Amino acid sequence: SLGPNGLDKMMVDKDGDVTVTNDGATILSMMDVDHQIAKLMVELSKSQDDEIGDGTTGVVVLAGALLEEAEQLLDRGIHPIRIADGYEQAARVAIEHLDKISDSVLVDIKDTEPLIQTAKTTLGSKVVNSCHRQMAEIAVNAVLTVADMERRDVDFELIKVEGKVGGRLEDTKLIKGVIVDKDFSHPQMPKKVEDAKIAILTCPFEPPKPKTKHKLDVTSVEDYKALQKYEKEKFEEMIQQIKETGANLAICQWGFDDEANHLLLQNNLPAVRWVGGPEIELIAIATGGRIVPRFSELTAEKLGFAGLVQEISFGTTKDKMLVIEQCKNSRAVTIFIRGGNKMIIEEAKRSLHDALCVIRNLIRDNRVVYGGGAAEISCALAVSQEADKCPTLEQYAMRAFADALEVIPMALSENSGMNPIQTMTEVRARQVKEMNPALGIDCLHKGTNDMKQQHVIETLIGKKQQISLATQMVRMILKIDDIRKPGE
Amino acid sequence: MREIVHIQAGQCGNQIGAKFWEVISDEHGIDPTGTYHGDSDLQLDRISVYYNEATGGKYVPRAILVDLEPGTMDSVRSGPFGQIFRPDNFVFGQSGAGNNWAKGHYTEGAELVDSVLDVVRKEAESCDCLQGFQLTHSLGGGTGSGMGTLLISKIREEYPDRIMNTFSVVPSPKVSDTVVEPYNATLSVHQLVENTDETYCIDNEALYDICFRTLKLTTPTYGDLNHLVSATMSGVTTCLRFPGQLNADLRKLAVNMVPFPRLHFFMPGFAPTFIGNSTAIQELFKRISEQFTAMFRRKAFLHWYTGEGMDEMEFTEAESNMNDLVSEYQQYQDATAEEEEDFGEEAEEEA
Amino acid sequence: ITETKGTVLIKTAEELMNFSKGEENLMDAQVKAIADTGANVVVTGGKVADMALHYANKYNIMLVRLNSKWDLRRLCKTVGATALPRLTPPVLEEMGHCDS
Amino acid sequence: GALEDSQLVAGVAFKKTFSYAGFEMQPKKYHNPKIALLNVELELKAEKDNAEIRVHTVEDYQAIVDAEWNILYDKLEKIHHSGAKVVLSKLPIGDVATQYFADRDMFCAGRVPEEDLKRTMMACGGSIQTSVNALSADVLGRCQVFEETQIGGERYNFFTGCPKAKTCTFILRGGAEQFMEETERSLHDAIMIVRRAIKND
Amino acid sequence: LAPVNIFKAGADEERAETARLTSFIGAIAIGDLVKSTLGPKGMDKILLSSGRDASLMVTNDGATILKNIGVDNPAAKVLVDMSRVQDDEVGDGTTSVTVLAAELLREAESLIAKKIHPQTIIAGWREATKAAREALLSSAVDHGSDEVKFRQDLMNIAGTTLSSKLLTHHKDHFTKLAVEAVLRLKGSGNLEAIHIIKKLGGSLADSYLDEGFLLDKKIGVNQPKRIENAKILIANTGMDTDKIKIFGSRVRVDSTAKVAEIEHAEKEKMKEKVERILKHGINCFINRQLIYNYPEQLFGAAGVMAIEHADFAGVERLALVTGGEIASTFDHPELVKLGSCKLIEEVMIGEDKLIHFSGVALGEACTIVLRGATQQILDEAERSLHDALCVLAQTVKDSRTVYGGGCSEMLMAHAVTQLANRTPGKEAVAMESYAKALRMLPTIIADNAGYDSADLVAQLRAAHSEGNTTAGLDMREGTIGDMAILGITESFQVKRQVLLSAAEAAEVILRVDNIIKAAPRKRVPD
Amino acid sequence: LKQMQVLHPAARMLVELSKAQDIEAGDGTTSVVIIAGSLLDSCTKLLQKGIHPTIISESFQKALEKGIEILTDMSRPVELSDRETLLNSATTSLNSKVVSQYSSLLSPMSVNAVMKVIDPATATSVDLRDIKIVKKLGGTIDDCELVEGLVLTQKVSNSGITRVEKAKIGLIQFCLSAPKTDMDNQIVVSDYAQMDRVLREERAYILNLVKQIKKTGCNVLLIQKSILRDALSDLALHFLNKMKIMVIKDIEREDIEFICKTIGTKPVAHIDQFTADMLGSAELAEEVNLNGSGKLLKITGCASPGKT
Ligand SMILES: Nc1ncnc2c1ncn2[C@@H]1O[C@H](COP(=O)(O)OP(=O)(O)O)[C@@H](O)[C@H]1O
Ligand SMILES: Nc1ncnc2c1ncn2[C@@H]1O[C@H](COP(=O)(O)OP(=O)(O)O)[C@@H](O)[C@H]1O
Ligand SMILES: [Mg+2]
Ligand SMILES: [Mg+2]
Ligand SMILES: [Mg+2]
């Protein structure tokens, strides 16, 4: 499952549900394993997913190759602590060499081309590659719209990703506003407004009610009539308070009443009902309004502004959705995914998440390396050259590290349908002869082995994390010599 | 602080109490040796209401165990959690009542109730201010019903204005284990009415039909029925034993729950607790009386009671007051009044 | 609090506003009255409330609690103090004394 | 993360707590803030469980309704006027309080663990307050930087820059649960050895 | 298999060869299950439930068949889901899409048997799909500016859609119901505005579309049974103990006469509300909630018909039909609009009575009465009329059409073949296979009628190769004919959706190389 | 066909077929099933000969179209004013059942009913819900009868009155009980005089309603069922008995329309609207006792009879 020519896995859940996926983290997450080493591999993949977001399957392959290569050394009479120490020293050499061959990119809104190329490289391995230029551009635009640049941090609660089945995958789009699964509260309200002034409320459209225990004693007929007048006076008062401030559309977190609904309709002021809390705060951030808990506290300065608010209707079903668009400079953004299967929607969501995480990583650190196995080949050459100067029985461990570091080009070649050993040897000879570390495996058969013009780009922190995390997990595995477990 | 002592009488009462105390002790961290190994001190805010602390750190339950036959104490001592009780609180006779109300109430009980009253005096002497009693017994037996009722009367005489609660099992509708069950039940309800603040009637068949259908797997003996009853009692008494958002002793539940003093019978429930004044009680008594008359009209098995000292009119008074109770319950619905006896004769003339 | 069930019954708004401040002021007065006798450490056999603990921390009073009903008596014998069932500023004769 | 990415903060740091709507509309970095440490539940609720209200007129009904809002706002203004910019509480903070603090450029957190709050007291130098009727300058904390940061999938609150601190905090980076557990077990031995070596040398 | 066990007990794993075998077997089985119901001469299936109390139905719809069977093969669930979402999107095309997906997988298995990597097949299919969609787009005919041509096209579309279902026994009659009803919507796509009422008895040709509206409700006692020149108020308000004065108030007095006085005041509140309602000048009142029997007599004394319990759907449909608004609070009679109709009466159909509105003002919502001799016939008739209405609404929204009877598939196949003849390598062998799939939909149709499918398909291919872009199967005789003359017309959206969905489903399934199953959740027997 | 439990899916359609006929005609439920079975039997040989099912369906449609014309040409027009033809048709429809021997009694009754419910000048259909069938055990089939009035099964709550001549009848939809607001109410007593006052005011409240009812001249009262509050208390029943009024309670909520259509009553849901013009007039209202099977209530001789 590695490279642009990799295949996918199909997992059937414990209740019968079906998932078709390509991510290493999800694959290892849905597997139910018994062996403890398998669980350790699963957790390694999950940790790599947690910090970086891409490269979840390269690390497990590297760890497996490292453990495989340690076997012959164990058979020749070497203490496993010595093997672990040699692996650690080789990892330090490789990491020191890795940032010497790295180039910066530049992160700025004006250009956006290196970022698009990076997202294209990340998305090239997924089923979304039929339209991956579009999705790459969507991802880069969303991250650049949300990101905080002074603190160099982005927040994924301000990016809303959601999809609906039907249509075509190419109908996926980016909305610089909000979209919610609600509709107007009265069937005869207008379906669109074009100069929306949004009043955001947290109080229900009902007469007030104290929280502590209370009783209202009615002891006469005049008391009954006074209470009867008080109810409708309260209703008219709240409607008038909403209308006076200049608002044009109202949004509530709770329900209404029939009287309140008809009074909202009669005064030419649409409303939305039963919207959730996160949606409330997203709308507040997008439209630039403020959240008020009472009608008394509503003022003209606390209304948001929206260029268009519309109710969109999908196909022959009865569902509806509400879209808020043409806002001013907004810190909230939505991705709207379409497609003809549910599995397609899920995999599109996962691929978009991968692209967003990669662009975030580029925001954090802005220097990159070139993929296709060029970086691994160069690191292996550096490790072997350093190991040739080590005579203290540790050269075997370093050479094992260098040999196991070369399983990524071989896996790529085997998946692409070429012959692994000859291709890897040719590329290694070319890299030694010439002086460029940017020669890799021509997976897509474009004729050239140079990855700088093919535009295959990866982040540096991803590579560093892969190497260090795999090495430390291998060191932890090698330390164990005993195991006790109950039988079944 | 406002201590409560617990009294168990009879085989069924002993079996239920032995699990009630077991399921309480694990909540408070007590051990079968009496020591304490709990973690949260929230368990010790109201520990003294049910346990008396002895020198050295042990905790002993405030319980008295009573029966007329030494069979059940030997099991209780030899069973689980049966070594935390005070060895001086076991009271037993030598013969047994043999499912006779009169023997329990007149002949064998009278020579043993003094020992129970001398033990409760010493258990009450050690509490700063007691508030009431807990009693567990049965209505279909001799020691559980007659002797238990005599003990209730004696306690009410000795302790005038302290609360009293009972957890009584009741005869089943379609099956009667004992031939003389209606007699014992009718003669015990008469004096349960006027000497208790509340009664928690528990049926054997109704709770017995939960293990087969809801628990999905059982062919059990009295066993798990007993554990379920103990769980119900613990769910009832959690308010007394533990503090919460609103703590309330059984009086603070009764005052909100019992408007009229003589209608103080309940039907429990359990959903993993519910306590309700459902008037479906009027259906149970209507059955028991239906049996009682059917036997009393034939004077069946009467000589077994008359020979012990009772008179014939005691049964008449008991059935009269049972009818009074049934009518008092019926006067609260006004819908069962629609089911009056269908008219059979043809005299429907001028007036 | 009262032994019989008691409820705080209010009929106007001002009582509702003033109740909590009244309770807090009363608790502060009680703690300060206890502290003014010169006691540095208070030992109790029951629960300690949050506000009482806050006021004890305000006036630099060491607070220790123990729940045995027997360790308390032995401590009372050790320091020569007399147990008190009320929360009142104690008299000099009921002071315990300890070097450390 | 890698084992060389572990860090020690001379201050305090703790995980993000559950938050209501409005938490994302308030600032997340301060330079010389004052910290209010509390043990008071700030939300619209019944005054007491024993309470009960009996009323005869609708005017008094409206007055009773307004009383609760007046009480909550009284507490909030008492907190605001002390000059504090960060507030912490072991007890829940409502959404109304969250939006009130967001509208005035402040930061709030609720249900903070007790150990973390004591640690913050020791690091910054205030005192836990169960009442808001006297929030003096001597009962507030003082740090040099407060921040909320992304650490490997989680959000962490950092109070750093206190030279009068009697407290430090470790952040350990690993790859699997047993890895960090073994790292902590290894560090415990060194901590105990250092303590014993300080006294007898 | 490695000696070490990585999995739990009950977990399962299948690798490349077995995975592909399982997937292809499942897909082909699903395709051949529903092949038999394609074209004007397909047959129906009986479905009976072992669990659901022996429910019985007779159906021809592909989605209905696939949503009811208990498939457990993972590769069949994808096809079932794709068919379901196709039904949800356009409402027609449910069988062609799954048949096409099955044929694509059947070709892919032989291609794999010829030692070709899956990715090569995927690339070839992607190029073929691009060419086919372009060729289909270039063939569309867009009417809509001219009314009579558009209406004739609508009639042709309805006739083509209803040909394969039972309603084809009376294809002309029901066609007149399908068009006119949609033309009542005045451009709104609300298919909930068309209410279908099915009731047993009578023949299938006795069905009709009403010129007014029908309610299956009842009026109160002692109120007029019919009104001429009606004025209608439509409301959504509480009238059974209306005084849910939502506060937590209570009555606390010291005398019984005070309770009687408060009871009388409670009655006066309802009287005042009813008077305020009557202030509008109405003689008909329709409410969605219950109406208690005191307002019932208040309305009866005033000579006003009252309808109670007409749920949200009925209220909205009446608002569309008559033109009023769903009012409340009844304080401003001037700002509320009332509905109008020429006559309201009661009609008797079968064994039931219904309220009939005639001479309505707008008519933007309609009702259809279906008659039949069995429950299954009525259910299938509704199930087919739904497809007809859905495709008609789609066509009205976007009015460009193509030709059916195998013309479109042959056009696509010819374009794909021309593309394949120009490219080098193994990908060409893939693209040709694509064409061989598209020419299977016409063949199957002929195979359902007993015609010599091979000769007909050869003739059709020869005709399309030389430029006769409107040739197709003539099934009433079984020959080759002009589709424009005969009037076999389909919508562009349905065909495009079929093509794209089938291609994407085949591509999704073809990329799987390993299947992993977790331990099933055991049903608790006892 | 309905009482059996046919298991085959095909045989589960035939039953539905019969149902349809029962809706459309009410007769010939057996013949339609016989005909369907015979046609399906004849289809087998055609299938064996090599015919296609489509051709068979089309030919069956052609044959049906011809057969309808033949049958229509057979027919003979009839007019509703000729009772002999209706009697012959009914007795033909009735001579296949167990009650054929009683046809000379059951044939006219049926006809009578259908001519007492419709308007022959403009009748286009008949509503059979206007004819109510009451089944009563006892006697023989020779005791069925036609009642041009109202028949009720529940007994009178009044103890003593069983005959009313020249009856005035009213229908009630409120309750003659103690006051109870729909809102939660309670009466608080803090002095010993209020305890007597409550009882006195209750008595006065009930007595006022009973006197208002008596003022209009009502002899027979019908009370509709209420399951939330008592519709008739013992005090009210005692007062009504003292004024010689016959009381009938527990009238179902679904037969009120039939009662109002039959005897001309107008339902009353408020005491203020209980006026002498909302009452119906009948010539006799009385309960009868069948020998051993029970009691019954007959109201006969309505001045304003409906079509029931
Ligand atoms: N166009 C390309 N040519 C050669 N190699 C590529 C190309 N695109 C991606 N790769 C390689 O694919 C690998 C990524 O594998 P992938 O399946 O995306 O999972 P992950 O990113 O989790 O490792 C990288 O090592 C990269 O070098
Ligand atoms: N009169 C006709 N002559 C030739 N082909 C027809 C005719 N009517 C329908 N078809 C064909 O039958 C197919 C319709 O399939 P159908 O059985 O209705 O189910 P679905 O539309 O869901 O696939 C269309 O491809 C259409 O080309
Ligand atoms: Mg990747
Ligand atoms: Mg079709
Ligand atoms: Mg017949």
Nearest CA to A70 among A393, A397, A423, A418?
A397
DSSP per-residue codes, B324-344: HHHHHHHTTTSSGGG-PPPP-
Contact assignment for A218 to E269 by CB distance below 8 Å:
no
CA angle A356, A361, A362 (to 5 degrees): 95
Q: Which two tokens stand for residue A310?
A: 């519309």
User: Exposed e or buried b for every residue in B44-70, given b needs 16+ CB within 10 A?
Assistant: ebbbbbbbbbeeeebbbbbbbbbbbbe
Evaluate whether the domain defined by B281-337 bears CATH number 1.10.287.600: yes
Alpha carbon distance A170, A482 (integer Å): 55
Q: Chain-centre distance of CA F1, in angstroms?
A: 27
Q: Which residues contact F70 (CB under 8 A, 6 or more apart)?
A: none
Q: Which one of 3.60.90.10, 3.40.190.10, 3.40.50.1440, 3.20.20.210 gives the CATH number of domain B1-259?
A: 3.40.50.1440
Show contacts of A432-439: CB within 8 Å, 24+ apart.
A432/A381, A437/A101, A437/A370, A437/A374, A437/A375, A437/A377, A437/A378, A438/A370, A438/A374, A439/A374, A439/A377
Chains A and B touch (3+ CB pairs under 8 A): no
Query: Is the Cβ–Cβ distance between E467 and E484 less than 8 Å?
Result: no
Residue A299 among the catalytic residues: no
For chain E, list residues whose CB is within 8 angstroms of any CB belonging to chain B: 524, 526
Residue F155, min C-alpha distance to chain B (Å)? 10
Nearest CA to A130 among A362, A373, A357, A339?
A339
Residue of A nearest to E514 (CA): A9
Contact assignment for E251 to A188 by CB distance below 8 Å:
no
Alpha carbon distance C7, D1 (integer Å): 57
Q: Which two tokens stand for residue A384?
A: 């072997």
Domain hosting E234: range is 213-395
Q: Which two tokens stand for residue A343?
A: 């599995």
**Phi/psi at A11 (5° precision):** -110, 130
Count of residues making up chain A: 488
Q: Please give the single-letter amino acid code of residue B224.
A: D
Residue of E nearest to B217 (CA): E526
**Is F230 an interface residue toward B (CB < 8 Å)?**
yes
Residue D55 is inside which H or E element, if any? strand D51-55
**Which neighbouring-strand residues pair with F270?**
none
Q: Is E39 annotated as a binding residue?
A: yes
Alpha carbon distance A403, A72 (integer Å): 12
Nearest CA to E285 among E272, E313, E304, E298?
E304
**Is C7 an interface residue toward B (CB < 8 Å)?**
no
**Phi/psi at F56 (5° precision):** -65, -45
The CATH code of the domain that includes A275 is: 3.50.7.10
Nearest CA to A97 among A467, A475, A474, A477?
A467
- Nearest 10 degrees: CA dihedral of C16, C22, C23, C29? 180
Residue E398, min C-alpha distance to chain B (Å)? 58
User: Exposed e or buried b for every residue in E370-400, given b needs 16+ CB within 10 A?
Assistant: bbbbbbbbbbbbebbbbbbbbbbbbbbeebe
Q: Please give the single-letter amino acid code of residue E186.
A: K
Cβ(E442) to ligand 2 under 6 A?
A: no
Tracing tokens 């598209």 back to the chain, one arrives at E438
Specify the 3-state DSSP secondary structure of E368: strand
**Which neighbouring-strand residues pair with E354?**
E347
Query: What's the gap in Å between E40 CA and the centre of ligand 4?
Result: 9
Q: Which residues contact F192 (CB under 8 A, 6 or more apart)?
A: none
* Option in F19, F183, F188 nearest E254 (CB): F188
Query: Is the Cβ–Cβ distance between E492 and E10 less than 8 Å?
Result: no
- Nearest 10 degrees: CA dihedral of A299, A301, A304, A306? 120
List of E strands, E217-257: 227-235, 249-253
Alpha carbon distance A5, A414 (integer Å): 10
Alpha carbon distance F72, A106 (integer Å): 93
Q: Which of the 8 DSSP states describes residue A130? A: G
Query: What's the gap in Å between E384 CA and the centre of ligand 4?
Result: 9
Residue of A nearest to D20 (CA): A277
Alpha carbon distance A339, E340 (integer Å): 45
Query: What's the gap in Å between F92 CA and the centre of ligand 5?
Result: 9
Query: What's the gap in Å between F97 CA and the centre of ligand 5?
Result: 9
Nearest CA to B262 among B168, B314, B192, B323?
B192
Nearest CA to B120 among B7, B278, B2?
B7
Nearest CA to A120 among A448, A331, A362?
A362
* Option in C5, C67, C70 nearest B44 (CB): C67
> CB within 5 A of ion ligand 3: which residues?
A 54
Chains B and F touch (3+ CB pairs under 8 A): yes
Edge-first strand order for the sheet with E512-517 is: A18-21, A8-12, E512-517, E12-14
Residue E59 CB neighbour total at 10 angstroms: 21
Residue A23 among the catalytic residues: yes
User: Exposed e or buried b for every residue in F77-111, given b needs 16+ CB within 10 A?
Assistant: eeeeeeeeebeeebbeeeeeeeeeeebeebbbebb
The catalytic residue among A21, A26, A49, A56 is A56
Give binding residues of D for ATP as ranges: 196
For D16, half-sphere exposure in the C-beta direction (CA atoms, 13 angstrom radius) is 16
Query: Is the Cβ–Cβ distance between E256 and F177 less than 8 Å?
Result: no
Query: Is the Cβ–Cβ distance between E509 and E14 less than 8 Å?
Result: no
Q: Please give the single-letter amino acid code of residue E149.
A: K
Query: Is the Cβ–Cβ distance between A90 and A397 less than 8 Å?
Result: yes
Q: Which residues contact E405 (CB under 8 A, 6 or more apart)?
A: E442, E472, E473, E474, E475, E483, E486, E488
Chain E contacts of B217, Cβ < 8 Å? 526
Backbone CA torsion sign across A251, A254, A260, A261: positive
Query: Is the Cβ–Cβ distance between B170 and B301 less than 8 Å?
Result: no
Number of H helices, E strands in chain C: 3, 3
Alpha carbon distance A391, C46 (integer Å): 73
Domain hosting A248: range is 178-363
Residue B219, min C-alpha distance to chain E (Å)? 13
Query: What's the gap in Å between A29 CA and the centre of ligand 1?
Result: 21
Give binding residues of A for ATP as ranges: 3, 56-57, 372
Residue A57 among the catalytic residues: yes
Q: E426-438 and E407-420 helices cross at what angle (nearest 10)?
A: 170
Q: Which two tokens stand for residue B267?
A: 């039907």
Residue E431, min C-alpha distance to chain F (Å)? 39
**Is D7 an interface residue toward C (CB < 8 Å)?**
no
Strand bridging mode E489-491 / E400-403: antiparallel
Cβ(E91) to ligand 2 under 6 A?
A: no
Query: What's the gap in Å between E161 CA and the centre of ligand 4?
Result: 6
Closest atom of ligand 2 relative to the E404 alpha carbon: 27
Ligand 2 mutation target, pool E34, E84, E164, most atoms within 8 A of CB? E164
Q: Please give the single-letter amino acid code of residue E454.
A: A
Distances (CA, A) of B39 to B42, B44, B242, F23: 9, 10, 15, 76
Nearest CA to C34 among C86, C96, C92, C87?
C87
Residue A223 among the catalytic residues: no
Alpha carbon distance E349, E326 (integer Å): 29
Residue F152 is inside which H or E element, if any? strand F149-152
Query: Is the Cβ–Cβ distance between D80 and D104 less than 8 Å?
Result: yes
Distances (CA, A) of A2 to A22, A471, E121: 9, 20, 19
Nearest CA to A37 among A400, A478, A487?
A478
Specify the 3-state DSSP secondary structure of A68: helix
DSSP per-residue codes, F212-263: HHHHTT--EEEEE--SSS-SB-HHHHHHHHHTT-EEEEEE-SSSHHHHHHHH
Q: Which two tokens stand for residue A249?
A: 């559309």
Query: Is the Cβ–Cβ distance between B302 and B316 less than 8 Å?
Result: no
**Which neighbouring-strand residues pair with A334?**
A160, A175
**Is B348 an interface residue toward F (CB < 8 Å)?**
yes
Cβ(E175) to ligand 2 under 6 A?
A: no
For A138, half-sphere exposure in the C-beta direction (CA atoms, 13 angstrom radius) is 28
Contact assignment for E88 to A127 by CB distance below 8 Å:
no
Specify the 3-state DSSP secondary structure of F282: strand
Nearest CA to E232 among E108, E343, E367, E71?
E343
Query: What's the gap in Å between E447 CA and the centre of ligand 2?
Result: 13
Q: Please give the single-letter amino acid code of residue F90.
A: A
Q: Please give the single-letter amino acid code of residue B7.
A: I
Residue A216, min C-alpha distance to chain E (Å)? 4
For E149, half-sphere exposure in the C-beta direction (CA atoms, 13 angstrom radius) is 10
**Is B121 an interface residue toward C (CB < 8 Å)?**
no
Alpha carbon distance B315, A105 (integer Å): 104
Binding partners of F (≥3 Cβ pairs within 8 A): B, E
Contact assignment for C8 to D50 by CB distance below 8 Å:
yes
Architecture of domain D11-198: 3-Layer(bba) Sandwich (3.50)
**Phi/psi at F280 (5° precision):** -100, 160
Chain D contacts of A223, Cβ < 8 Å? 56-57
**Phi/psi at B3 (5° precision):** -70, 155
Strand bridging mode D154-160 / D145-151: antiparallel
Residues 181-200 of F with CB under 8 A from E: 181-190, 194, 197-198
**Phi/psi at F265 (5° precision):** -70, 165
Specify the 3-state DSSP secondary structure of A416: helix
Chain E contacts of B216, Cβ < 8 Å? 524, 526
Nearest protein Cα to ligand 2, atom 8: E160
Alpha carbon distance E157, E403 (integer Å): 10
Alpha carbon distance E166, E43 (integer Å): 9
Q: Please give the single-letter amino acid code of residue E181.
A: A
Nearest CA to B133 among B104, B105, B83, B167?
B167
Alpha carbon distance E100, C90 (integer Å): 95
* Option in B334, B348, B349 nearest F230 (CB): B334
DSSP per-residue codes, A151-202: TTB--GGGEEEEE-SBS-GGG-EEESSEEES--BSSTTS-SEESSEEEEEE-
Q: Please give the single-letter amino acid code of residue A180.
A: V
**Phi/psi at A341 (5° precision):** -145, 160
Nearest CA to A238 among A179, A295, A165, A173?
A295
Tracing tokens 């209530």 back to the chain, one arrives at F297
CA angle B72, B74, B75 (to 5 degrees): 65
Chain A contacts of E251, Cβ < 8 Å? 217-219
Query: Is the Cβ–Cβ distance between E343 and E227 less than 8 Å?
Result: yes
Residue E517 is inside which H or E element, if any? strand E512-517
Alpha carbon distance B119, B115 (integer Å): 6
* Option in E250, E256, E374 nearest F205 (CB): E256
Nearest CA to B195 among B224, B146, B229, B160?
B160
For E522, half-sphere exposure in the C-beta direction (CA atoms, 13 angstrom radius) is 5
